[PDB]
Amino acid sequence: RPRFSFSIAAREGKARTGTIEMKRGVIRTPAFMPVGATVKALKPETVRATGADIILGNTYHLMLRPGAERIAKLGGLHSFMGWDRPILTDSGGYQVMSLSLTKQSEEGVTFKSMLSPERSIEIQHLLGSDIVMAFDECTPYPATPSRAASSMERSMRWAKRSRDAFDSRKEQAENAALFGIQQGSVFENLRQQSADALAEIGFDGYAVGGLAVGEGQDEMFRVLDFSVPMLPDDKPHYLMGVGKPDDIVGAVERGIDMFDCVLPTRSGRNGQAFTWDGPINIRNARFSEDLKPLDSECHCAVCQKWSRAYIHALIRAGEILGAMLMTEHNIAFYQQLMQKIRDSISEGRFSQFAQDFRARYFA
Amino acid sequence: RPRFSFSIAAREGKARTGTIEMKRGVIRTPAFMPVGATVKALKPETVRATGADIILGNTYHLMLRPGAERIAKLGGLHSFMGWDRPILTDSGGYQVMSLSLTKQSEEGVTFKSMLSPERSIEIQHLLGSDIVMAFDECTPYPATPSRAASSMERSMRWAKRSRDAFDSRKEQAENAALFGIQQGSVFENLRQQSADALAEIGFDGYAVGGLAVGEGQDEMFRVLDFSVPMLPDDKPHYLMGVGKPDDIVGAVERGIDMFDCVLPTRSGRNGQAFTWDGPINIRNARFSEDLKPLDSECHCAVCQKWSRAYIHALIRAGEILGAMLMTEHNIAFYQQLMQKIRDSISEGRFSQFAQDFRARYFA
Ligand SMILES: [Zn+2]
Ligand SMILES: [Zn+2]
C-alpha cells in the first residue's frame, strides 16, 4: 500500500464515499474513529469486530502516562496496545487546555498536569502515529473576531512549523501522513484565510477545527456550509470531535469524510444506548424486564446475546461487564451508521437515507 | 446426560480425578469454579475459553438485585447471563452474615441489606441452579466446642429441611443436584457427627464447610486430614471458598474434588497476577518496561497478546481493560493449575507435580 492515497468512489451532492489507503490498512470513508492506552473497556479485536478501520489515539493522556519516550522504547503504540491498523493521533493541543496552570506563548504551551508544535509532532512520531495532526491553538466559543483572528493566525504559523518538523524526520515523512486544521471560529472570512494558508502549505488531509465547542447544530451546520467547500476537494475532510449521530449525517451531507468523538464510549458507560429509534437510558426502570436487545436491528454481538434487562441490571450494579457491553454496542452502532452512510452514497440514495434516518430517530 | 453421575477415573493416594456428568455439561474434577450477575469483567465465552466447566452463582447478591423471582420470569440465570453450562449456587447463608441487622433463629435468618432453608432452596430453584447447596449456619473461627456443636447441630437440622424442600419440588429434584455441607469447626468429633448426619440424609455431593475463615493453611490441612475421609468416597468433595494455588494443591492431596474462591478475580482487579514463579504485583515500577507476558508459560490470550508493561500502565490508570486482562489471565492460570493437577493424577505423578509446583512457586 502507499503511504497515503485518498480515492473518491462515489458522490451525491456534497457527500462523498471512498477510501484512504495507508501502509497499515484501508480506511473506508466516511469514517468514524473510536477514541481511546485503550479504547475504554474494549479489546482491540472487539473494536475491529465492530467495523472500525482506524482509531484515534489520545496524545495528551499518553505523553503523561506512560510517556511517549517509554512507549517508543516499548515498540510504539500499535505494538503496545495490540492494534495493528492505522491510528490517528491528536496533537495534544485541546486537552492541554481542557485538562492541565497553562502559559501560552508563540513558542507553544507550558503546562502542569512545554508542548510546542515541534514537540507535538515528535511525540506523535514516538507513538508511531499513522495520521499526525498539526499542533494548533484551540479557539473558545464564543470568540470575538479579533481573538478568533489572532488564534487562527497563530495556528497557521504553527501549521507551517508542524509541516516542517514532520518533513525533517525522514521515517515519519515517508510512512505517516499529516493533516492541517482549519480554524477561524464561526467567521467566514477567517475560515477562508485559514483554508488558503493551509492549502499553500499543503497537507494530506484537512480538519475542520473549533466546532465541537457548544455552538449548537444549527450554527455548526451553517459554518460547515461555507467552510468545507474552501478545503481542497481531493483530500479528506475531518470534523474533529463530532458527534451525535444526526450531527454526523448532517456533516456528511456537507462534505465531511472523517469523525471522532467520545460520545458512544462515554455515554455507553453512563447507560445511554444508541438505537435507530433514538438513544435510550438503560438504567430506566422500564427496561428491568425487557427481553429485547438494545436495538432491534443491530447486528452486534451484544444484541445477539444479551437482553436490555440483563444490561440494565449490570449498569445498575456498577458492573464492569455493563460498561463493556454498552460500549461494544454503541461503537458497533456508530460503525453501522457509517456503513449505511457509505452504502447509501454509493447507491445514490443518501439523501433519502438521511430523511428516513431522522424521521425514525426523532419520531 | 444423566441428572448427576460422578465417576472417578484415576487415583493417587487420597487424590482423585474424574468427571461429573449433568444435563448441562460435564465437569472435570478436580474442578475450580469461577465466582460471579457476571463473572466480574468477563464475558461468559471468555470464562469458558479459559477452561471453566462450571461457575459458582452468588445467590445473596442476586436475590437482592435483580431478585430471584425477576430472574425466573426472565428465563433463569443461564439465559440471563448467557452461560449454558452447569452453575453451582451457594445458599446465601454466609453472605447473609458477612454483608447484611441479622436475627438468627431455628426458622432461618432475618436480615436487612427471612432466609430459611426452604426459601434458600426455592431461590436456587428460581435461579435455575444445577448444583443446589443446602442452607447452613456458618461457624465463626475461632469457635468454642459448645458453640461449634450447636451451630453444626442446627446446620444438620437445616440440611434435612433442605433435602425435603429440594425433593418436594419435582422439576428441581429431577434436573438439579443437592450438596450437603459438613460443619463442626476444627473438632474431629463434631466433623464425624456432621459427616454421619449428612450421609444418613443422603446427598449428591458433600462440601467441607467452615474452613475459609482465617485459620491458616497448617490448621486447614490438619482438619482436612481427618474430615475428608469421613465423607462418602464415591461422591464429590467440595472445599468451599478455597483458595490460594498451594491451598488447592494441598486440598487435592487430601481428597478434595471441587473449589471456588474470589482470589483470582478480586486480586486480579487489584493488580496481583498469578505465575508459576508465584504471584506478582503488576503495579510495581519494575514492570513498567517489562515486555514479557504476565507468565512465561501461560497459554491464555492475554499472555499471547500483551506485555506486563502494557497491563502495568492500564492498572496504574484504573482502566477497565486492565481489570479485564488481569482477570482473564488469573482465571486461566487457575484452570491451567486444575488441568495440570488432573493430568498428573491421571498419570500417577501428582505427588511429583505437587513437589515441583511448590519448589518453583515459593522459590
Ligand atoms: Zn448492538
Ligand atoms: Zn496468561
CB neighbour burial string for A320-358, b if at least 16 within 10 angstroms, e if fewer: bbbbbbbbbbbbbbbbbbbebbbebbeeeebeebbeebe
| A244 lies in the same domain as A275 | no
CA A116, A117, A123, A126 dihedral sign is: negative
Interface check for A97 against chain B (CB to CB < 8 A): the answer is no
The overall longest dimension of chain A from CA atoms, in Å, is 61
Asked if B260 is an active-site residue, the reply is: yes
CB atoms B82 and A305 under 8 Å = yes
Shared domain check, A210 and A283:
no
- Given the residues B130, B204, B247, B260, select the one marked as catalytic: B260
Residues B118, B235, single domain; the answer is: yes
Give the residue from B328, B335, B305 showing the smallest Cα distance to B44.
Answer: B328
Measured CA to CA, the distance from residue B302 to residue A242 in angstroms comes to 33
Q: Which of B260, B279, B303 is the last residue of a domain?
A: B260
Q: Which helix (H) or strand (E) holds B125?
A: helix B117-127
Residues A271 and A257 in one domain: no
Measured distance CA(A195)–CA(A155) in Å, rounded: 12
The values of phi and psi at residue B15, to 5°, are: -80, 145
Q: Is A38 on the interface with B (CB under 8 A)?
A: yes
**Which has the closest alpha carbon to A247: A219, A281, A282, A289?**
A219
CA quadruple B326, B329, B334, B335: dihedral, nearest 10? 140
| Deposited experimental method | X-ray
Any chain A CB within 8 A of the CB of B324?
yes
A193 and A314 in a single domain? The answer is no
Say whether both A324 and A289 belong to one domain: yes
- In sequence order, the 6+-apart residues with CB closer than 8 A to the CB of A222 are A186
Supply the Cα-derived Rg of chain B in whole angstroms: 20
Catalytic residue among A53, A90, A247, A257: A90
CB A141 within 8 A of CB A210: yes
- How many whole angstroms separate alpha carbon B352 and alpha carbon B134? 36
Note if the bond before A241 is cis, omega within 30 degrees.
Answer: no
Name, in order, each residue with C-beta under 8 angstroms of B266's C-beta and a sequence gap of 6 or more: none
Report residue B269 as a C-alpha cell: 482487579
Q: Which long-range contacts (CB under 8 A, 24 or more apart) does B158-161 make?
A: B158/B117, B158/B134, B159/B134, B159/B197, B159/B198, B159/B201, B159/B203, B160/B201, B161/B116, B161/B117, B161/B118, B161/B135
Could you give the CA distance from residue A137 to residue A134 in angstroms, rounded to a whole number?
A: 10
B331 and B247 in a common domain: no
- Give dist(CA A311, CA B278) in Å, integer: 36
Burial B24-50 (b: 16+ CB within 10 A, else e): bebbbbbbbbbbbbbbbbbbbebbbbb
User: Does the beta-carbon distance from B38 to A321 stay under 8 Å?
Assistant: yes
Same domain, A120 and A229: yes
Give Cβ neighbours of residue A202 (< 8 Å, ≥ 6 apart): A163
How much distance in Å is there from the Cα of B177 to the middle of ligand 2? 33
Grid cell, residue B200, equals 444418613
Question: Within this chain, do residues A213 and A356 fall inside the same structural domain, yes or no?
Answer: no
Q: Residue A338: which of A259, A276, A269 has the closest Cα?
A: A259
Q: Kindly state the DSSP code that residue A285 receives in the 8-state scheme.
A: G
Q: Of B233, B260, B287, which one is at a domain's C-terminal end? A: B260
Question: Which CATH number fits the domain that encloses residue A53?
Answer: 3.20.20.105
Q: A20, A52, A23, A21: which is closest to A36 by C-alpha?
A: A52
Taking the CA atoms of A83, A84, A85 and A87 in sequence, report the sign of the dihedral they define: positive
Residue found under cell 486447614: B220
Q: Which residues, including other chains, have CB under 8 Å from residue B238's CB and lie 6 or more apart?
A: B179, B205, B206, B207, B208, B256, B257, B258, B259
Looking at the fold, whether B203 and B272 belong to one and the same domain comes out as: no
Whole-number Å distance between alpha carbons of B189 and B288 = 53
C-alpha B287/C-alpha A129 separation (Å) is: 25
- Say how far apart CA A231 and CA A245 lie, in whole Å: 23
Count of CB pairs separated by less than 8 Å, A with B: 90
Are residue A203 and residue A55 in the same domain, yes or no?
yes
Asked if residue B275 and residue B141 are part of one domain, the reply reads no
Residue B53 per-residue DSSP state: S
Place of cell 461487564: A321
Q: Assess contact for A124 and A132: CB atoms under 8 A.
A: yes
Q: Which domain holds residue A272?
A: 267-361
Among A209, A237, A261, identify where a domain stops.
A261
What secondary structure letter does DSSP report for B74? T
Helix or strand holding residue A351 (H, E): helix A350-361
The number of domains in chain A is 2
